[PDB]
From Swiss-Prot:
It is found in: Cytoplasm; Nucleus; Chromosome. The lineage of its organism: Eukaryota, Metazoa, Chordata, Craniata, Vertebrata. The modification N6-acetyllysine is found at residues 51, 188, 214, 236. This is Histone acetyltransferase p300. It comes from Homo sapiens. Functions as a histone acetyltransferase and regulates transcription via chromatin remodeling. Acetylates all four core histones in nucleosomes. Histone acetylation gives an epigenetic tag for transcriptional activation. Mediates acetylation of histone H3 at 'Lys-122' (H3K122ac), a modification that localizes at the surface of the histone octamer and stimulates transcription, possibly by promoting nucleosome instability. Mediates acetylation of histone H3 at 'Lys-18' and 'Lys-27' (H3K18ac and H3K27ac, respectively). (Microbial infection) In case of HIV-1 infection, it is recruited by the viral protein Tat. Regulates Tat's transactivating activity and may help inducing chromatin remodeling of proviral genes. Binds to and may be involved in the transforming capacity of the adenovirus E1A protein. Interacts with HIF1A; the interaction is stimulated in response to hypoxia and inhibited by CITED2. Probably part of a complex with HIF1A and CREBBP. Interacts (via N-terminus) with TFAP2A (via N-terminus); the interaction requires CITED2. Interacts (via CH1 domain) with CITED2 (via C-terminus). Interacts with CITED1 (unphosphorylated form preferentially and via C-terminus). Interacts with ESR1; the interaction is estrogen-dependent and enhanced by CITED1. Interacts with HIPK2. (Microbial infection) Interacts with human adenovirus 5 E1A protein; this interaction stimulates the acetylation of RB1 by recruiting EP300 and RB1 into a multimeric-protein complex. Changing residue 112 to W: Loss of activity. The chain holds residues 1287 to 1664 of 2414 of the full protein.
């Protein structure tokens, strides 16, 4: 292969995740399984500027910063089936480091999560996604991020997160499974002493004695900005946090004393400037354009190829 998944530029994140997976796979000793290559394909710096009315209430009065500088990263899992690569799992993340003011100091928030259900074998499918996610929650806990945040949100019909045109027979999870599927992922992270504990947003906030909306983390296109702005008031937020708690996790990686003695986070990985994988829209555009689909396996093997072709010559700029 001239343009293969492996032959993409490596990173310390990319190598850390693909290790834990092949480590997990090799011990399972299923003969159908194959090599999983994990790559970071976009890393850049960004901010999430506070919205007009939250701004007016707290930013203008001095009590809150006007924006929060995070690093965005896009990363993809590729299996080798029939001796050809298959992009099976993508993930977009916001990383708010130590130099970020509160209340985004040392937090990761997963922008987006997606899959194409042709990972082999299909019994290890869900298991492998869990490794990639615990592997990311482990990686960042070691760099020294205290808290992770997940919006447990299933996709809508007629719209896709990352991959254009999913398999017709790959069913979307109903809210209650997706919640159980994350709880499934986390309870395993807890047993490996990676996660200290996790809580729904309401319980976390009930136990952190939050008395102001400026204390609630403020992520890019997360639910809670839109709620606070549509609210324009602490009660209103305790109503909404309570009603929706089950969808919004707070994953504590570093706890108690060890959280206050932290040296500053230093991401060792360099920035990967990539036009295509800057947010979800530009990649969905290219796939729509060039008639690409992840509908069938052979179609998905086609698409990963034309995805990599485009990636290797946009890096070469
Ligand atoms: N709870 S579960 O055990 O069923 C399960 C299994 C695997 C996964 C891994 C991620 N999978 C995607 C996903 O399927 C889809 C995204 N866009 C779609 C459009 C049409 C049909 C499907 C998709 C996904 C699903 C939910 C939320 C984000 C991304 C997740 C959950
Ligand atoms: Cl998601
Ligand atoms: Cl983005």
């Amino acid at each position: 292969m001239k343009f293969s998944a492996k032959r993409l530029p490596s990173t310390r994140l990319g190598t850390f995740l693909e290790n834990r997976v092949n480590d997990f796979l090799r011990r399972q000793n299923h003969p159908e399984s194959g090599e999983v290559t994990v790559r970071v394909v976009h890393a850049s710096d960004k901010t999430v500027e506070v919205k007009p009315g939250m701004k007016a209430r707290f930013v203008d009065s001095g009590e809150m910063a006007e924006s929060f500088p995070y690093r965005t990263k896009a990363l993809f899992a590729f299996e080798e089936i029939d001796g050809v690569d298959l992009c099976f799992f993508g993930m977009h993340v916001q990383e708010y480091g130590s130099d970020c003011p509160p209340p985004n100091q040392r937090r990761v928030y997963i922008s987006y999560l997606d899959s194409v259900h042709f990972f082999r074998p299909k019994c290890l499918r869900t298991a492998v996604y869990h490794e990639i996610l615990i592997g990311y929650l482990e990686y960042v806990k070691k760099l020294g991020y205290t808290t992770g945040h997940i919006w447990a949100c299933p996709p809508s019909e007629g719209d896709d997160y990352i991959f254009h045109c999913h398999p017709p027979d790959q069913k979307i999870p109903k809210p209650k499974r997706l919640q159980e599927w994350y709880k499934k992922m986390l309870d395993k992270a807890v047993s490996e002493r990676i996660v200290h504990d996790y809580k729904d947003i309401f319980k976390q906030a009930t136990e952190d004695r939050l008395t102001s909306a400026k204390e609630l983390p403020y992520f890019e296109g997360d639910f809670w900005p839109n709620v606070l702005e549509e609210s324009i008031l602490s009660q209103k937020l305790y109503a909404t946090m309570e009603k929706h708690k089950e969808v919004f996790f707070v994953i504590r990686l570093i706890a108690g004393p060890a959280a206050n003695s932290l040296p500053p986070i230093v991401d060792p990985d360099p920035l990967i400037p990539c036009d295509l994988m800057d947010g979800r829209d530009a990649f969905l555009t290219l796939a729509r354009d060039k008639h690409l689909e992840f509908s069938s396996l052979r179609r998905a093997q086609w698409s990963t190829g034309c995805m990599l072709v485009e990636l290797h010559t946009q890096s070469q700029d």
